[PDB]
Design an enzyme around this catalytic site. Structure first.
Site, mmCIF file in Angstrom:
data_model
loop_
_atom_site.group_PDB
_atom_site.id
_atom_site.type_symbol
_atom_site.label_atom_id
_atom_site.label_comp_id
_atom_site.label_asym_id
_atom_site.label_seq_id
_atom_site.Cartn_x
_atom_site.Cartn_y
_atom_site.Cartn_z
ATOM 1 N N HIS E 202 31.249 -47.053 -29.945
ATOM 2 C CA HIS E 202 31.351 -47.454 -31.351
ATOM 3 C C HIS E 202 32.014 -46.418 -32.250
ATOM 4 O O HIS E 202 32.115 -46.613 -33.465
ATOM 5 C CB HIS E 202 29.973 -47.763 -31.929
ATOM 6 C CG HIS E 202 29.268 -48.891 -31.251
ATOM 7 N ND1 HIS E 202 28.066 -49.392 -31.703
ATOM 8 C CD2 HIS E 202 29.580 -49.603 -30.141
ATOM 9 C CE1 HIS E 202 27.665 -50.364 -30.899
ATOM 10 N NE2 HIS E 202 28.565 -50.511 -29.943
ATOM 11 N N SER E 206 36.350 -51.074 -28.979
ATOM 12 C CA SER E 206 36.854 -51.491 -27.679
ATOM 13 C C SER E 206 38.358 -51.359 -27.519
ATOM 14 O O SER E 206 39.151 -51.576 -28.445
ATOM 15 C CB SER E 206 36.470 -52.936 -27.402
ATOM 16 O OG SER E 206 35.072 -53.095 -27.446
ATOM 17 N N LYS E 228 30.976 -65.620 -25.777
ATOM 18 C CA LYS E 228 31.718 -65.308 -24.554
ATOM 19 C C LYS E 228 30.739 -64.621 -23.583
ATOM 20 O O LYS E 228 30.571 -65.043 -22.426
ATOM 21 C CB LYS E 228 32.899 -64.362 -24.859
ATOM 22 C CG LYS E 228 33.896 -64.232 -23.705
ATOM 23 C CD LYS E 228 35.002 -63.208 -23.973
ATOM 24 C CE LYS E 228 36.068 -63.162 -22.837
ATOM 25 N NZ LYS E 228 37.046 -64.315 -22.765
ATOM 26 N N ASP E 229 30.085 -63.573 -24.076
ATOM 27 C CA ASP E 229 29.129 -62.825 -23.284
ATOM 28 C C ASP E 229 28.100 -63.697 -22.566
ATOM 29 O O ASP E 229 27.886 -63.561 -21.366
ATOM 30 C CB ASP E 229 28.415 -61.803 -24.168
ATOM 31 C CG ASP E 229 29.242 -60.563 -24.392
ATOM 32 O OD1 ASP E 229 28.818 -59.685 -25.171
ATOM 33 O OD2 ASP E 229 30.320 -60.461 -23.776
ATOM 34 N N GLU E 272 22.995 -50.131 2.025
ATOM 35 C CA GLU E 272 23.336 -51.404 1.428
ATOM 36 C C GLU E 272 24.830 -51.333 1.053
ATOM 37 O O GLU E 272 25.331 -50.268 0.666
ATOM 38 C CB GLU E 272 22.483 -51.626 0.192
ATOM 39 C CG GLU E 272 21.035 -51.833 0.481
ATOM 40 C CD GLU E 272 20.776 -53.165 1.137
ATOM 41 O OE1 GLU E 272 21.424 -54.164 0.719
ATOM 42 O OE2 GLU E 272 19.915 -53.216 2.057
HETATM 43 C C1 HEM Z 1 24.648 -47.487 -17.163
HETATM 44 C C2 HEM Z 1 25.448 -48.764 -17.240
HETATM 45 C C3 HEM Z 1 26.409 -49.032 -18.205
HETATM 46 C C4 HEM Z 1 26.180 -49.918 -19.175
HETATM 47 C C5 HEM Z 1 24.887 -50.799 -19.265
HETATM 48 C C6 HEM Z 1 27.523 -49.962 -19.853
HETATM 49 C C7 HEM Z 1 27.765 -50.760 -20.908
HETATM 50 C C8 HEM Z 1 28.903 -50.819 -21.565
HETATM 51 C C9 HEM Z 1 29.074 -51.693 -22.691
HETATM 52 C C10 HEM Z 1 28.001 -52.566 -23.360
HETATM 53 C C11 HEM Z 1 30.357 -51.533 -23.037
HETATM 54 C C12 HEM Z 1 31.115 -52.278 -24.095
HETATM 55 C C13 HEM Z 1 31.752 -53.569 -23.609
HETATM 56 C C14 HEM Z 1 32.577 -53.403 -22.327
HETATM 57 O O1 HEM Z 1 32.004 -53.468 -21.218
HETATM 58 O O2 HEM Z 1 33.802 -53.201 -22.426
HETATM 59 C C15 HEM Z 1 30.886 -50.473 -22.209
HETATM 60 C C16 HEM Z 1 32.134 -49.957 -22.312
HETATM 61 C C17 HEM Z 1 32.649 -48.976 -21.508
HETATM 62 N N1 HEM Z 1 31.972 -48.405 -20.461
HETATM 63 FE FE1 HEM Z 1 30.254 -48.751 -19.838
HETATM 64 N N2 HEM Z 1 28.477 -49.147 -19.289
HETATM 65 C C18 HEM Z 1 27.845 -48.686 -18.207
HETATM 66 C C19 HEM Z 1 28.428 -47.919 -17.268
HETATM 67 C C20 HEM Z 1 29.629 -47.338 -17.333
HETATM 68 C C21 HEM Z 1 30.217 -46.606 -16.215
HETATM 69 C C22 HEM Z 1 29.555 -46.144 -14.911
HETATM 70 C C23 HEM Z 1 31.465 -46.329 -16.607
HETATM 71 C C24 HEM Z 1 32.429 -45.707 -15.805
HETATM 72 C C25 HEM Z 1 32.392 -44.214 -15.428
HETATM 73 C C26 HEM Z 1 31.568 -46.843 -17.989
HETATM 74 C C27 HEM Z 1 32.702 -46.881 -18.729
HETATM 75 C C28 HEM Z 1 32.896 -47.593 -19.884
HETATM 76 C C29 HEM Z 1 34.143 -47.535 -20.630
HETATM 77 C C30 HEM Z 1 35.348 -46.622 -20.341
HETATM 78 C C31 HEM Z 1 34.010 -48.427 -21.641
HETATM 79 C C32 HEM Z 1 35.125 -48.720 -22.622
HETATM 80 C C33 HEM Z 1 35.362 -50.188 -22.603
HETATM 81 C C34 HEM Z 1 36.704 -50.563 -23.150
HETATM 82 O O3 HEM Z 1 37.706 -50.210 -22.503
HETATM 83 O O4 HEM Z 1 36.765 -51.214 -24.219
HETATM 84 N N3 HEM Z 1 30.459 -47.516 -18.384
HETATM 85 N N4 HEM Z 1 29.995 -50.061 -21.258
HETATM 86 C C1 IKR Z 2 16.723 -44.105 1.159
HETATM 87 O O1 IKR Z 2 17.914 -44.591 1.757
HETATM 88 N N1 IKR Z 2 18.420 -45.629 0.969
HETATM 89 C C2 IKR Z 2 19.506 -46.142 1.456
HETATM 90 C C3 IKR Z 2 20.110 -47.257 0.667
HETATM 91 O O2 IKR Z 2 21.130 -47.813 1.015
HETATM 92 O O3 IKR Z 2 19.343 -47.482 -0.423
HETATM 93 C C4 IKR Z 2 19.815 -48.526 -1.281
HETATM 94 C C5 IKR Z 2 20.215 -45.756 2.704
HETATM 95 C C6 IKR Z 2 19.870 -46.494 3.870
HETATM 96 C C7 IKR Z 2 20.498 -46.198 5.114
HETATM 97 C C8 IKR Z 2 21.461 -45.165 5.168
HETATM 98 C C9 IKR Z 2 21.814 -44.428 4.030
HETATM 99 C C10 IKR Z 2 21.195 -44.708 2.768
HETATM 100 C C11 IKR Z 2 21.591 -43.904 1.584
HETATM 101 O O4 IKR Z 2 22.991 -43.653 1.679
HETATM 102 C C12 IKR Z 2 23.603 -43.239 0.530
HETATM 103 C C13 IKR Z 2 22.836 -43.059 -0.662
HETATM 104 C C14 IKR Z 2 23.461 -42.631 -1.832
HETATM 105 C C15 IKR Z 2 22.482 -42.480 -3.051
HETATM 106 C C16 IKR Z 2 24.860 -42.379 -1.821
HETATM 107 I I1 IKR Z 2 25.789 -41.749 -3.546
HETATM 108 C C17 IKR Z 2 25.614 -42.558 -0.640
HETATM 109 C C18 IKR Z 2 24.998 -42.989 0.543
HETATM 110 C C19 IKR Z 2 25.832 -43.162 1.769
#
Ligand code: HEM
Ligand code: IKR
Ligand code: PEE
Ligand code: PEE
Ligand code: HEM
Ligand code: BOG
Ligand code: BOG
Ligand code: ZN
Lengths: 146, 101, 48, 61, 380
Positions: E202, E206, E228-229, E272
């Site tokens: 914010h 976006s 949309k969401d 998984e």
């Molecule tokens: C913990 C989970 C997360 C939640 C619940 C979350 C949620 C959101 C929300 C609500 C938005 C605004 C709408 C949209 O999706 O564009 C957003 C935007 C964004 N999030 Fe996340 N996010 C998460 C994880 C991440 C992760 C792991 C990344 C990547 C390293 C990331 C990168 C971004 C970026 C770069 C934006 C900008 C969106 C745009 O380009 O407009 N977010 N995120």
């Molecule tokens: C406790 O083991 N849990 C596992 C799983 O898949 O949980 C959802 C599991 C089961 C079998 C073999 C390896 C794992 C965890 O492996 C992982 C876990 C994490 C975090 C990452 I980054 C990367 C790898 C490769």
């Protein structure tokens, strides 16, 4: 005024032979447009929902003076007559009008405004630095509940 | 040796921002530099750049593009900002190296 | 191994039905509202 | 003219609207389940205990 | 102070200016829904998470039986469980799309919003990892051991870090219990950061598919994107329920239906799907330490992405070259995933090392290079 909403605003009831435009128009700074509109659409609503007998009694006494006012001179009289006939057919006297007005009450208003205002798709004209008015959709929804 | 030109022209149609009615320089990401140049743009050129984008967005939201006849053409694309830009980058590059002195 | 089995599938059914119907509905409303934008038209009329 | 009549008595006032959804939903549930359950069972004719129950309920020993 | 009551209320001013009056581009696509989804996803896991936790017993002699009881005795217990385990996947799917999106539109130029993102991911990853051990099944157990045992590759300061982490000399009760605590905690920490994530967002608004100032035409989040969401939600929730209601264990390996036994090791130990890609990279390098690093960096790399942007343009929309390199990358992950669900025999191994080798190569050399080269073709 409390919030410096605009510069001017006006309610209008343009009437044409078979149709008409009912609404309002306000002028304002680029940053108060919204609040203003909001409040306006608001009042409009209140009209269809909680208009009081005090509001009408006052509105009537105002309207009376306003009608009488249109007939201040010769020019303004012929205008009315030129119109009355042409549009209405006959010519309506202040005596007629007035009574037609004394007959109105709160209850009556809420019903008529409701009829032409409530949940209706409206027309919008925005002109100038209007980056804040935005979204018909929103504007639309402001047509119900208040 | 028109190899280059042939390519540049290709890629140009490859990226296809013309389809949106954009100009190369419209698509420019607004980093600090670009941000500056744009402010320098003469009323008209700027106001035009604007619409083009607002138009393009409206397209993208609509999920459409411009009719083939309206797309822009490699040679008719006007690099309206490049010059303004270069200079900015020149001006800055100067300042920067002078604060080291 | 999974007594639920049955009841779970009975659910899947109910879920698929509600699901399909409620997604359809939402899709309308999404479009409906968005129409305003997708139908929109704009022109660039300077003073020249 | 149901659409008309509807928009008037039902979907008009945000109050009668809501009030409809409530009651409406009530009906929906009450009758969506029946259909669903019925459909489900049919697709499993004679496999459920609801069917093969008559074989031990008051007919043995 | 103000007319209405959602701009002058120190609370509604936060439920409003963040979800209703919020300035949103008018052209963001479906790849922007993952945001809210990711959220909603959390909102749910936590809920189903508790509901389960209210019936679970963290103890190497009751963990399995409790989970089992939870399914067989608790009302809708089984249902509540499925949803949770599957909610996990749904969660990752949404995250990966979310992330990909950001990469394909240079949303990562929003540095903070990005880094917070990455962290959020990290936390999510750790979170699952612990949650997996809880049911204490074969896979639960062994996945624990295999992974935790990597730490012992660090020099000196690690052979200890491990016995500390276990609370003993091997994965045992002391661990289970602390993992449960950890699994209860982290989700909240995720919710927390998520708040910070949305804040840094914010601060700029976006990014839009075209990659050019949206100021020229922005729409109110509501009803445009709120609507949309929700549609987006349903269009996903469907398969999520569909698989979780008709094919429950389609995803989950069976060895986890066998109460953990430290004495016997499962034929194949594999995580998984959402950890597969990583598993594959870990196993590509023969040298616990190296593989560890590769794993780390395999995900840590993300932080670099921003500093690896060379195009004068932001989104790949107008950059054909980058695009395919991007899809080559995506597919490159699919492969790694697959390679991870396979043993350590030829050809797999070689294919393995390659895939990983190309994974880094792309994000490190191609992408930035093809970017530069791209720029010159525009004649910039
Ligand atoms: C913990 C989970 C997360 C939640 C619940 C979350 C949620 C959101 C929300 C609500 C938005 C605004 C709408 C949209 O999706 O564009 C957003 C935007 C964004 N999030 Fe996340 N996010 C998460 C994880 C991440 C992760 C792991 C990344 C990547 C390293 C990331 C990168 C971004 C970026 C770069 C934006 C900008 C969106 C745009 O380009 O407009 N977010 N995120
Ligand atoms: C406790 O083991 N849990 C596992 C799983 O898949 O949980 C959802 C599991 C089961 C079998 C073999 C390896 C794992 C965890 O492996 C992982 C876990 C994490 C975090 C990452 I980054 C990367 C790898 C490769
Ligand atoms: C026994 C069973 C009966 C009991 C039912 C209990 C539930 C009671 C609910 C009350 C009904 C709500 C009334 C809302 C009325 C407000 C309104 O105006 O409509 C909604 C309004 C639309 O505006 P207009 O179309 O312009 O209408 C203007 C009217 N002149 O806002 C909306 O878009 C909301 C409606 C869409 C809902 C979408 C939700 C999708 C979610 C589904 C996921 C499934 C469920 C799982 C829940 C998880 C919980 C842990
Ligand atoms: C890591 C774990 C990886 C595990 C695999 C995840 C599951 C893989 C499923 C396959 C995905 C296929 C999706 C098909 C989408 C096809 C498509 O729409 O392509 C065209 C279209 C072109 O867009 P524009 O140029 O803006 O259009 C202009 C306006 N008309 O592309 C897009 O929609 C944008 C691309 C976003 C999708 C990315 C999803 C892939 C997910 C992988 C995660 C990758 C990131 C790195 C993770 C590190 C850990
Ligand atoms: C960050 C969100 C969450 C994720 C990603 C997540 C993930 C998981 C995972 C991966 C499992 C293994 C499931 C299986 O057996 O297949 C699990 C189990 C469990 N989770 Fe969560 N969980 C989350 C939140 C929670 C929360 C917030 C609680 C409660 C504070 C919780 C409590 C449990 C319990 C009781 C189990 C063990 C029993 C079971 O497997 O059903 N989870 N979780
Ligand atoms: C399959 O039928 C199910 O059987 C259950 C009990 O066995 C009930 O609680 C469910 O409501 C019913 O749908
Ligand atoms: C996308 C949202 C889908 C929601 C689908 C609701 C399905 C819940 O339906 C359930 O079916 C069971 C089997 O008969 C019954 O025993 C439960 O009482 C009933 O609530
Ligand atoms: Zn197996």
């Amino acid at each position: 005024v409390e919030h410096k909403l605009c510069h001017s605003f006006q309610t209008f009831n343009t009437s044409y032979s078979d149709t008409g435009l009912f609404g309002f128009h306000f002028v304002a700074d680029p940053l108060s447009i919204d609040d203003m509109m909001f409040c306006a659409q608001g009042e409009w609503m209140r009209l269809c929902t909680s208009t009081t007998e005090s509001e009408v009694k006052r509105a009537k006494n105002h309207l009376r003076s306003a009608m009488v006012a249109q007939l201040d001179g010769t020019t303004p009289v012929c205008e009315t007559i030129g119109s009355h006939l042409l549009n209405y057919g006959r010519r309506i006297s202040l005596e007629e009008w007035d009574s037609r007005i004394s007959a109105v009450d709160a209850r009556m208003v809420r019903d008529v405004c409701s009829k032409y205002i409530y949940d209706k798709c409206p027309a919008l004209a925005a002109v100038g630095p209007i980056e804040q008015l935005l979204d018909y959709n929103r504007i639309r929804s402001g047509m119900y509940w208040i | 040796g028109r190899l280059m030109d042939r390519i540049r022209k290709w890629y140009y149609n490859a990226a296809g921002f013309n389809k949106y009615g954009l100009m190369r320089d419209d698509t420019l990401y607004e980093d600090d530099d670009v941000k500056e140049a744009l402010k320098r743009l003469p009323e008209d050129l700027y106001n035009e750049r604007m619409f083009r984008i607002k138009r393009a967005l409206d397209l993208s939201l609509k999920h459409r593009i411009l009719p083939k006849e309206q797309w822009v053409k490699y040679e008719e694309d006007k690099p309206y900002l490049e010059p303004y830009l270069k200079e900015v980058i020149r001006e800055r590059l100067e300042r920067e190296a002078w604060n080291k002195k | 191994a999974e007594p639920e089995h049955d009841q779970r599938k009975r659910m899947g059914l109910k879920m698929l039905l509600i699901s399909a119907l409620l997604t359809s509905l939402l899709y309308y409303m999404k479009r409906h509202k968005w129409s305003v934008l997708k139908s929109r038209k704009m022109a660039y009329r300077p003073p020249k | 003219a149901l659409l008309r009549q509807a928009y008037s008595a039902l979907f008009r006032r945000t109050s009668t609207f809501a009030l409809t959804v409530v009651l409406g939903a009530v009906l929906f549930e009450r009758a969506f389940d029946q259909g669903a359950d019925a459909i489900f069972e049919h697709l499993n004719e004679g496999k459920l205990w609801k069917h093969i129950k008559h074989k031990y309920e008051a007919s043995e020993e | 102070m103000a007319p209405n009551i959602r701009k002058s209320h120190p609370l509604l001013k936060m439920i409003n200016n963040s979800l209703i009056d919020l300035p949103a581009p008018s052209n963001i696509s479906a790849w922007w829904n993952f945001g809210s989804l990711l959220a909603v996803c959390l909102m749910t896991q936590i809920l189903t998470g508790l509901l389960l936790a209210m019936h679970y017993t963290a103890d190497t002699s009751l963990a399995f039986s409790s989970v089992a009881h939870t399914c067989r005795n608790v009302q809708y217990g089984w249902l509540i469980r499925n949803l949770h385990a599957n909610g996990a996947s749904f969660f990752f799917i949404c995250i990966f799309l979310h992330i990909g999106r950001g990469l394909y539109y240079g949303s990562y130029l929003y540095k903070e919003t990005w880094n917070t993102g990455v962290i959020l991911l990290l936390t999510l990853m750790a979170t699952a990892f612990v949650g997996y051990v809880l049911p204490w099944g074969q896979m639960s157990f062994w996945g624990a051991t295999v992974i935790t045992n990597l730490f012992s590759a660090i020099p000196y300061i690690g052979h200890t870090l491990v016995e500390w982490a276990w609370g003993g000399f091997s994965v045992d009760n002391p661990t289970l219990t602390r993992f449960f605590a950890l699994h209860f905690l982290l989700p909240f920490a995720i919710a927390g950061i998520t708040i910070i994530h949305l804040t840094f967002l914010h601060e700029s608004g976006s990014n839009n598919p075209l990659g050019i100032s949206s100021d020229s035409d922005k729409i109110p989040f509501h009803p445009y994107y709120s609507f949309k969401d929700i549609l987006g939600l349903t269009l996903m929730l469907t398969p999520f329920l569909t698989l979780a209601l008709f094919s429950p264990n389609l995803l989950g390996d069976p060895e986890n239906f066998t109460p953990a036994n430290p004495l016997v090791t499962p034929p194949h130990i594999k995580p998984e799907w959402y950890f597969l890609f990583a598993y594959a990279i870990l196993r590509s390098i023969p040298n616990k330490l190296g593989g560890v690093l590769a794993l780390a960096a395999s995900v840590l790399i993300l932080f670099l992405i921003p500093f690896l942007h060379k195009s004068k343009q932001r989104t790949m929309t107008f950059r054909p070259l980058s695009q395919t390199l991007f899809w080559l990358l995506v597919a490159n992950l699919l492969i790694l995933t697959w390679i991870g669900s396979q043993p350590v025999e030829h050809p797999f191994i070689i294919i393995g090392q390659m895939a990983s080798l190309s994974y880094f190569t792309i994000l490190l050399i191609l992408f930035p290079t093809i970017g530069t080269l791209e720029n010159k073709m525009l004649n910039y």
